Structure formats: structure tokens, C-alpha cells
Amino acid sequence: VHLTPEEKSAVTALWGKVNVDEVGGEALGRLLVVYPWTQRFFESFGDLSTPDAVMGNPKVKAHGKKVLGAFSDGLAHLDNLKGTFATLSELHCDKLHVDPENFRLLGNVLVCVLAHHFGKEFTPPVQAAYQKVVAGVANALAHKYH
Amino acid sequence: VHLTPEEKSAVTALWGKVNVDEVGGEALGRLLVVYPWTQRFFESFGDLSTPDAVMGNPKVKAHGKKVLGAFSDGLAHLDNLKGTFATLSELHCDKLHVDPENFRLLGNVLVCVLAHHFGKEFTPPVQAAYQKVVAGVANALAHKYH
Amino acid sequence: VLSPADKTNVKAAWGKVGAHAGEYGAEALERMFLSFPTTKTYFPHFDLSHGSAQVKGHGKKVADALTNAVAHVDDMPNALSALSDLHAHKLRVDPVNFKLLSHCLLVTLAAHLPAEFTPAVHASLDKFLASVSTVLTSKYR
Amino acid sequence: VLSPADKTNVKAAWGKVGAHAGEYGAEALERMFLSFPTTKTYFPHFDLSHGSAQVKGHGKKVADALTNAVAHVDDMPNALSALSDLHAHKLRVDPVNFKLLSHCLLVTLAAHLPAEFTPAVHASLDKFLASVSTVLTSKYR
Ligand code: HEM
Ligand code: HEM
Ligand code: HEM
Ligand code: HEM
Ligand SMILES: OC[C@H]1O[C@H](O)[C@H](O)[C@@H](O)[C@@H]1O
Ligand SMILES: OC[C@H]1O[C@H](O)[C@H](O)[C@@H](O)[C@@H]1O
């Protein structure tokens, strides 16, 4: 992912101000609610039956943190996304057989969530740069299909 | 694209019977009919107002055998797809900005046309082997978006 | 959204399926399972071998449900509600899978009924099948 | 297909747009051009400088159509019949672009109205935006 070095740090900047214990869980939780067929990869998670049941589920928040961390790994190494997500790519593609359209959906709900949490500070130039980062994660995760 | 020895012989065997002058124009033509938003890329071709205007177009037909020819260079070197399609990747991605979902739909309409011509010769295992080639062509054509 | 001309092309071509319904449904299914093995994960309880009695039986119901949908083309949400509940609510089917079966239903219709598989009919059939998939993948209860 | 509870969420939440409509449809457009430069193809002569009056005008037309789509949620094919004419027959807009705009519409609703944008309302808005896109990329007349 090629960012104008403005971009590179306008993104680092929003990400330190990210509640690391709560935004993965909201992004993961909105995926399962907005795209309900995604709950199939997560049947081991118990109660997933209403938005409120999904959003307050402890397994969702726990897993949302591990997802967000993988993203944090991504922002750190924007020049090597395919080496960072190679282990994850194999997991999501070869074992879990997740259709890669879903990678893109998650990354865009993460954008709707960052926008939710920062409002007027998540501006078009700021989105624009996150769209490239999140396209890059999805591409890198989908590498085992390419 | 990793095919078996018999998948490879079954594919080679069915292609040899393909009329090089007609199948690609028939594939391109149904793309334009089945998915009309694709006509926007071929505005210099002339009349595409009706299904019979599309299928009786000498431009669609002439451009079709160009598409087919590139699929043919595909089957000839399935170990070197990315590079067979490197020049076309850049044209379709960087000059033309064709959404890669359209690469997948054209591959499928060609399968539909292969089925239509070869009927019961076009068997489940023969389709399966062609879907591999066709996803390989679309994934290689899309390489500039990766 | 289907055109008047779309409804007519589908009726005209599905109508010619007749007694081969379950043969085409089950061929479509086999086509799906061999072309895209990820789809198999939805049928862990089935024998999915070429000769399979379950595939042939399930082949029938899909095809008959499609005839059912042609007959109510003007408002399938109501005609296919038990089907919507099953696929969207209970099975949680990834809608990519509906694109795969649809493609395999057109591959079968091309191979069996080539006099009917004109571009216009092809176009209508593709639109029809997408309308159905949209219905079976949505939660509207 | 939208549920009865989808329509409630959409009507309720979209109704809070009011005077901000042309502001919101304009920002949504700007998010789309910045984030997705490929969408610029359809607007080759637009002025797209940050505050361009062309973009605010067009921003207003886009929002007022959505406001009217909500009013006719059970009758959109006929309600937005001419908008399909434009987008599908004339412009021949690739449906991928509808997803990219719909998403930017959702980012603009979350950034401005966080209290409306619950998970449930998010799902409903997403579905409602997909249903309008199907009407505007379809040919059915
Ligand atoms: C696009 C961004 C995504 C990121 C950054 C991400 C990240 C992660 C990480 C770090 C793990 C833990 C891996 C481990 O501990 O070995 C994981 C597990 C998993 N992910 Fe993903 N993921 C993404 C997308 C998805 C999507 C879209 C789905 C399904 C719709 C999915 C399904 C799963 C499943 C089923 C597991 C492990 C199963 C379980 O713990 O129950 N992931 N993901
Ligand atoms: C996925 C399979 C495809 C293959 C193998 C393919 C192959 C080709 C080839 C061989 C050429 C000619 C290059 C030359 O000038 O020597 C070409 C040009 C072109 N292709 Fe494709 N193509 C594919 C899909 C598509 C799709 C989906 C679209 C748009 C919907 C498209 C639009 C075009 C356009 C607009 C040109 C330039 C034609 C002109 O001069 O107006 N192609 N392609
Ligand atoms: C053309 C669209 C489809 C139609 C018309 C359709 C129709 C049906 C019908 C009639 C049944 C029988 C259920 C009953 O008797 O209560 C069924 C069940 C089922 N469907 Fe679908 N279906 C479609 C697409 C799909 C897809 C894409 C998948 C996933 C790959 C899928 C997975 C299943 C499964 C696992 C069952 C239950 C099988 C069993 O336990 O016997 N369907 N569907
Ligand atoms: C939510 C989906 C959309 C809605 C509700 C919408 C609404 C509208 C309306 C009402 C008009 C015509 C204004 C008038 O004459 O009264 C219009 C025109 C137009 N739209 Fe859309 N639109 C949507 C999506 C899109 C998308 C995704 C694109 C492509 C990126 C697009 C490209 C255009 C273009 C090029 C025009 C004509 C602009 C000109 O005057 O040159 N629209 N839209
Ligand atoms: O990776 C970025 C690309 O994503 C999508 O495929 C777009 O349709 C394409 O035009 C864009 O350049
Ligand atoms: O002639 C075509 C031109 O006129 C139309 O009215 C459009 O508004 C304009 O943007 C377009 O380039």
C-alpha cells in the first residue's frame, strides 16, 4: 500500500486514539449483524440471535481484539502486508474457506465504525487513506486465492 | 492453474473442436447482452441496442476472436498465466479500469457458450477443469489490482 | 427487477423443462460440487458421489421450487418464505453460493435445451435466478 | 428484500436528515471521488474542487431521490422508473459503483448521526441502499 507520507501518519494518528479493547468487537459485531451469513464461521460463539445479543457477546469482543491487533500489525508494516498476513491468509483461505468478498465487507464496516467513533475528524481525505489500508489487508488475506 | 493429467487432456480435447472464428464473438456478445452495463466499454463498436444487433455486429465478432486468441495463449501456457496476461492486465486495469468482477462474468458466459455448443460432451468434470482455467485467466488479468 | 419480456422468456424456457426437472436439478448440483468444492460444506449429511440418491432427491426439490418461482414470478417473496427462512435464517448460506448454483443451472439449460438458450433467454434466465437468490438470502420476517 | 422492521429503522433514521440532505449527499459524493477515483469516469466535466457548487447541487438531487425512495419503499421500481432509465439504459453505470456510493452514504450517516447508527439501523440502511441500487441498475420497462 503506497501512501503519501501525509496519509501514512494521518492514519497512525487516528489509530493511537483507538480504544483497542472495544473497536474490533464493534467491527466484528456489526459484520455478524449487517451480513448475517457470517455467523456460520462463528457457531462456537453461543448467543448471536439479536443485535443486542451479538454486541454484548464476550466471545465477539474477545475476537474483535485479535482482529484489530492483526490490523494494527498491518498499519505497522504497510510495505509488507503479504508477509504479515501470510499465516492468516492460509488460515482464512485454505482451512476456513472464507469467500474473500467478506474480507472487504469487514474492512468497510471497520471504516463505518471509525467514522462512528470520530465523526467530523474522520474526513474524506482521512477515509480515503483508510480505504487503501483496508483494501491492502483484504488483498493480502486473499493472497492464497491469487 | 494446477490441473490433473486427465483434466488437461479433457480441456485440450474440447478446445480443438472450438471454432476460433465464432466462439469468442459469441462469448463477448452474450456478455454485452446478459450484462448490459458492459456495452459502455465498447461504444465505438456501433449498434448494440438489441440482442440481434449485438450478435450480428462485425466488431463484436472481430474483437471476439481477439479475446478467444488470448484464452488460447492461456491454455498453451497454464504455468505462465500472470505473464501471458501482463500487457492486457495493464490495459484492462490501468487504462480501462474494468472492474475485475466483469473478468469473472465473461469467463462464465464462455463456459455457458462451451456448454451450448458441445452439449452433453460438456460434462461435470470437464466444466470443473474449465472453471479452473477461467478463474485463472480472470485472476491473471486482475494482477494490476493486487 | 425483471422486464415483461424477461417473465415471458423464462416461462417459455422453464416450461420446456417438464419431466427432466430432477435430472437437471441434480446435474446442476453435481456441476456445482465438482466445480466449486467449497459448496460441499453445506451438505455434510449427504452422500455426494456421482450416483447419489440424496443428490437426485434434493435435485428434484430445487427444480420444483424453481417451477414454483416461475409461477409466482410477480411476487416470489411470499411464495418462497419457507425457503427464505431456511437458507437465510437457518443455514446462513453465503450468497456467493447462489451465484455458483445459478451459473450451474444455466450450464445445464444450455447443454440440454440449446434451441431455447438464445442470448435474450440467457439474459432473462440470469436475471430470474438472481431475483430468486436475493429472496432466499434475505431475512424479511 | 426488506423486513417490516427494516422499513421502520430506515424511515425513522433517514427522516432525521431533513435540511442536511444536500450536505450529506454532497459529502457522500466527495467521499466517493476521493476514496474511489474510478467513479470519476462518469463525471468527466464536473468541477470537483472541495466545495464545488456543482457537487452540492448534485449532492442535493441524490439525497432528495433517496428521501423519495423511502416514501415509496414498497413501490420503488415504479417510483424510480426514470432514474433506472438514466443509470441503467443511458449511463450504463457498472453496479460496483453503487456499492461504493452506498458505503460512502453510510460513512456520512455514521459520522454525523452516531445516535441513529445503531447496529440494527446500520443493517437496515445497508439493505435499503442495496434495494435502491438494484432498481437503478436494472432494465425492466
Ligand atoms: C478482513 C480482515 C480480518 C482480519 C484482520 C482477521 C483476523 C483474524 C485473527 C487474528 C484471527 C485469529 C487467528 C489465530 O488466532 O490463529 C482470526 C480468526 C478467525 N477468523 Fe478472521 N479476520 C478477518 C476476516 C475474517 C472474516 C471476514 C471471517 C468470516 C466471515 C473470519 C473468520 C474467522 C474465523 C472463523 C477464525 C477462527 C475461528 C474461531 O476462533 O472461532 N475472519 N481472524
Ligand atoms: C476476462 C477475459 C478477457 C480477455 C481474455 C480479454 C482479452 C482482450 C484482448 C486480447 C484485447 C485486445 C488487446 C489488443 O488490442 O491487442 C482486449 C481489449 C479490450 N477489452 Fe478485454 N478481455 C477480457 C475481458 C474484458 C471485459 C470484462 C471487458 C469490459 C467489460 C473488456 C474490455 C475491453 C476493451 C474495452 C478493449 C479495447 C477494445 C477497443 O479497442 O475498443 N475485456 N481484451
Ligand atoms: C436456485 C436456488 C436454490 C433453491 C431454489 C433452493 C431450494 C431448496 C429446497 C426446495 C430445499 C428443500 C428443503 C425442504 O424440503 O424443506 C433446499 C434445502 C437446502 N438447501 Fe437450497 N436452494 C437453492 C440454493 C442453495 C444453495 C446455493 C445452497 C448452498 C450451497 C443451498 C443449500 C441447501 C441445503 C444444505 C438444504 C437442506 C438439504 C437437506 O438437509 O436435505 N441451497 N433448498
Ligand atoms: C443511491 C444511488 C443513487 C441515487 C439515489 C442517484 C440519484 C441521481 C439522480 C436523481 C440523478 C439525476 C438528477 C436529475 O436530473 O434530476 C442522478 C444522475 C446521475 N448519476 Fe446517480 N444516483 C445514484 C448512484 C449513482 C452512481 C453509483 C453513479 C456512478 C458513480 C452515478 C452517476 C450519475 C451520473 C453521471 C448522473 C448524471 C450527472 C450529469 O448531469 O452529468 N449515480 N443520480
Ligand atoms: O484495487 C483498487 C481497484 O479496486 C476495484 O477492483 C475497482 O473497481 C478498481 O477500478 C480499483 O482500481
Ligand atoms: O452533453 C452531455 C453533458 O450534458 C448533460 O446535461 C450533463 O449534465 C453534463 O454533465 C454532460 O457532460
Write down the domain spans for chain D. Answer: 1-141
Which residue's CA is the closest to the ligand 5 atom numbered 2? B145
What class has domain C1-141? mainly alpha
Q: Is the dihedral of CA C105, C107, C112, C118 positive or negative?
A: positive
Annotated binding residues of A for heme b, as ranges?
Answer: 63, 92
The vertex-B92 CA angle with B90 and B96, nearest 5°, equals: 105
Q: Is C140 on the interface with D (CB under 8 A)?
A: yes
Ligand 1 centroid, distance to A139 Cα (angstroms): 15
CB-CB contact of C113 with C13 (8 Å): yes
Which residue's CA is the closest to the ligand 5 atom numbered 9? B99
CB-CB contact of D16 with D63 (8 Å): no
C70 CB near ligand 3 (under 6 Å): no
CB-CB contact of B11 with C80 (8 Å): no
C99 CB near ligand 3 (under 6 Å): no
Q: How far apart are CA C92 and CA D130, in angstroms?
A: 19
Which residue's CA is the closest to the ligand 5 atom numbered 6? B99
If you count residue pairs, one on A and one on C, with CB atoms under 8 Å apart, how many are there? 19
CB-CB under 8 Å, C93 with A36? no
For a mutational test of ligand 1's pocket, the pick from A88, A93, A145, i.e. the residue with the most ligand atoms closer than 8 A to its C-beta, is A88
Chain C CB contacts of D141 under 8 Å are: 3
Which residue's CA is the closest to the ligand 5 atom numbered 10? B97
Q: How far apart are CA A137 and CA B128, in angstroms?
A: 30
Best mutation target, C2, C102, C104, C107, to test chain B (most B CBs within 10 A): C107
Q: Is B2 on the interface with C (CB under 8 A)?
A: no
Which residue's CA is the closest to the ligand 2 atom numbered 24? B103
CB-CB under 8 Å, D106 with A127? no
What ligand is nearest to the CA atom of residue C57? 3
Elucidation technique: X-ray
Q: Is B27 on the interface with C (CB under 8 A)?
A: no
What CA–CA distances, in Å, run from A105 to A60, B31, C60, D19?
17, 27, 34, 30
3-state class of D47 per DSSP? coil
Q: Which residue is listed with cell 437457518?
A: C90
For residue D23 the three cell numbers come to 450536505
Domain assignments of chain B as residue spans, ordered by start? 1-146
Q: Report the residue from C38, C96, C139 with minimal CB separation from A101.
A: C96
Ligand 2 centroid, distance to C108 Cα (angstroms): 27
D96 CB near ligand 5 (under 6 Å): yes
Q: How far apart are CA D104 and CA D35, in angstroms?
A: 9
Chain C CB contacts of A102 under 8 Å are: 94
Q: Is C23 on the interface with A (CB under 8 A)?
A: no
**For D20, which DSSP code?**
S
Q: Is the dihedral of CA A34, A36, A39, A41 positive or negative?
A: negative
Ligand 4 centroid, distance to D93 Cα (angstroms): 9
D25 phi and psi angles, rounded to 5 deg: -75, -30
C65 CB near ligand 3 (under 6 Å): yes
Note the resolution in Å, 1 decimal: 2.3
What ligand is nearest to the CA atom of residue C45? 3
C79 CB near ligand 3 (under 6 Å): no
For residue D56 the three cell numbers come to 452540492
Q: How far apart are CA A8 and CA A129, in angstroms?
A: 8
Chain D CB contacts of B39 under 8 Å are: 92
The vertex-C133 CA angle with C76 and C82, nearest 5°, equals: 55
The vertex-D68 CA angle with D67 and D71, nearest 5°, equals: 95
Nearest to A93 by CA among A43, A45, A139: A139
CB-CB contact of A1 with D93 (8 Å): no
Does the domain made of A1-146 have the CATH classification 3.40.50.920?
Answer: no
CB-CB under 8 Å, B51 with C123? yes
Q: Which residue is listed with cell 443455514?
A: C91
Best mutation target, D92, D133, D137, to test chain B (most B CBs within 10 A): D92
What are all long-range contacts of C32-40, with beta carbons under 8 Å and residues at least 24 apart?
C32/C100, C32/C101, C32/C104, C34/B124, C34/B125, C34/B127, C34/B128, C35/B124, C35/B127, C35/B128, C35/B131, C35/C100, C35/C104, C36/B131, C36/C100, C38/A97, C38/A99, C39/C97, C39/C100, C39/C101
Q: Is D43 on the interface with A (CB under 8 A)?
A: no
CB-CB under 8 Å, D94 with B40? yes
Cβ-based burial of C56 (10 A; exposed 0-12, middle 13-18, buried ≥19): middle
Q: Is C119 on the interface with B (CB under 8 A)?
A: yes
Non-local (6+) Cβ contacts of C48 within 8 A are C33, C40, C54, C55
Best mutation target, A6, A23, A34, to test chain D (most D CBs within 10 A): A34
Q: Assign residue A110 a region: left if phi > 0, alpha if psi is -120 to 50, beta otherwise?
A: alpha
